[PDB]
Structures are given as structure tokens and as C-alpha cells.
Design a protein around this ligand. Structure first.
Ligand code: ASP
Ligand code: ASP
Lengths: 143, 142
């Protein structure tokens, strides 16, 4: 520990980082799945793969595993605002990604491309970037 | 308060940003190639050329962050060990840049055939190894 339980803040950032990266690979997988889905316009797309969609399911499960860990460890009262905003945000992005797997799972390319996914993602990154600031800024104080 | 721990955190944020932007580049490229398969009226929604262009941009910013990282160094043995991160980054960056020209030149065969995921994994580990060595090994050793 030390700097306001430095190790703690170090572990939470590790969990959030892995959760974040894992949600990004989930989106990559969906996308690679979608691009390969041959059912568009004047083109046969590419090697029809649903394994990639299955992968998406797995990575989202893994990201959910890490967040579950971030949520069950020594919660600091000062990080209460930052942590909740991280929750307004994670639940929305995780639900966005699942609306997507559900669309690719039923051939609903109507809804898949139309979903404003990037906005949901940015909002989480903002929340995550904010958690990082709070954990250091004026939080590195007292030692 | 130490020069070592402080420069280690600074480097962690530069790498995190690089990694994120390279992941963001891959996502932008993929969304373009998907939109490139049907080409259903390119516009605000079907921002295919626009996603290809954003991919060029996020990759350029990744490059910049790495610049800051390589533009500094006080740690001895660490760097020696972590020439691994540079190798893996050198590799993955070229992979992303090549996918941009394949997509740009409409070479879909080449875009899908490239073993991108293998190169990104290699980098993610190099990064996790950097953190392994930074943590304790230096975070305690000064
Ligand atoms: N809207 C979805 C699918 C797509 O546009 O390719 C996304 O942002 O991933
Ligand atoms: N090989 C490229 C394109 C694709 O396979 O979707 C990638 O893995 O990003």
C-alpha cells in the first residue's frame, strides 16, 4: 500500500484496463464477423465466419469477469463518484455490445450498422479516463 | 517521490494510449471494409472512405505517443529487456499501415489474409511484460 493504498488503486486500474481492452476486441470480433458475412450488395464479402461471432461472446464474458473483480475489492469512499459514473457507463457499453451480438446472431444487419456504438464507447473511455485522474490528481496527496 | 516511479507511470500512459489507438485503428479499418463490401450509398452513416481516413489518423496519433515513449530514458537494464516492446510495436505498426494500403487500393484478398491478430497479441504480451518488469523489479529497485 502506501500512497493512499497505492496497490489497491493499482489493481483496480489493472482490472479496468483489461475490461476495457477486452470490450474493444469484442467490437473488433463483431466487425470481422460482419465483414465476412456474405449477404450485402454487389459483392460476396468474405469467408463466412460465425466462429468470430462466438469469439465475441467469449471476450465479452471475459470483460465481464474482470469488471466483476473490479467491483469486489476494498472500495475507497473518495472514489465513490468516479466509480458510479464508471457504472452509468460500463452497463451501457456492455449492453450495446450485446444488442450487437444479438443482431449478428439473427441476421439483423438492419440494426447492426445503424447502432451508435462509437458514442457509447467514448462515453466509457471518458469515465475511465476520469477514474484515472481521480486516483492520482489530488489523490497522490498525503504521504 | 522518485524520478524512477514517476517516469515509469508516464511511460505506462504513453503505451496505454498507443495500444488503445492501434486497437481503435483496427476497429476503424474493419468498419470500413465491412462498408466496402456492400457500398450502400456512402454518406454520414456509410462513412467508408471517412473510416479509412480516421484509421489513418488514429494510427498517426499512436505513432506520436510512442514517440514520447522512445523520446525518454533513465532506466538501465529495463530498456535492455524492453527492446521487446519496440520490436513488437515496429511489427504491429507495419501490419496496420499495410492493411490501410490494401483497403485503399481495394485489395480485399490481402486485407483478410493478413495474420493481424497474431501480431497484436504479440504486442499485448510485450506490453504486459513491460509492466511485469516495471512493477516491483524497478518499482522497488532504484
Ligand atoms: N455500428 C456498429 C457496426 C458498424 O457500424 O460497423 C459499430 O459501431 O461497431
Ligand atoms: N486480417 C485483418 C482483416 C480481417 O481479417 O478482418 C484483421 O484481422 O484485422
Amino acid at each position: 500500500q502506501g500512497f493512499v493504498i497505492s496497490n489497491e488503486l493499482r489493481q483496480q486500474q489493472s482490472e479496468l484496463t483489461s475490461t476495457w481492452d477486452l470490450m474493444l476486441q469484442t467490437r473488433i470480433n463483431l466487425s470481422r464477423s460482419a465483414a465476412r458475412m456474405m449477404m450485402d450488395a454487389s459483392n460476396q464479402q468474405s469467408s463466412a465466419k460465425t466462429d468470430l461471432l462466438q469469439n465475441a461472446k467469449t471476450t465479452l464474458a471475459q470483460a465481464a469477469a474482470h469488471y466483476a473483480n473490479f467491483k469486489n475489492m476494498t472500495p475507497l469512499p473518495a472514489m465513490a463518484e468516479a466509480s458510479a459514473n464508471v457504472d452509468e457507463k460500463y452497463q451501457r457499453y456492455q449492453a450495446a455490445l450485446a444488442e450487437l451480438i444479438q443482431f449478428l446472431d439473427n441476421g439483423n444487419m438492419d440494426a447492426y450498422f445503424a447502432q451508435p456504438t462509437q458514442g457509447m464507447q467514448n462515453a466509457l473511455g471518458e469515465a475511465l479516463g476520469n477514474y484515472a485522474r481521480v486516483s492520482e490528481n489530488l489523490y497522490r496527496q498525503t504521504f
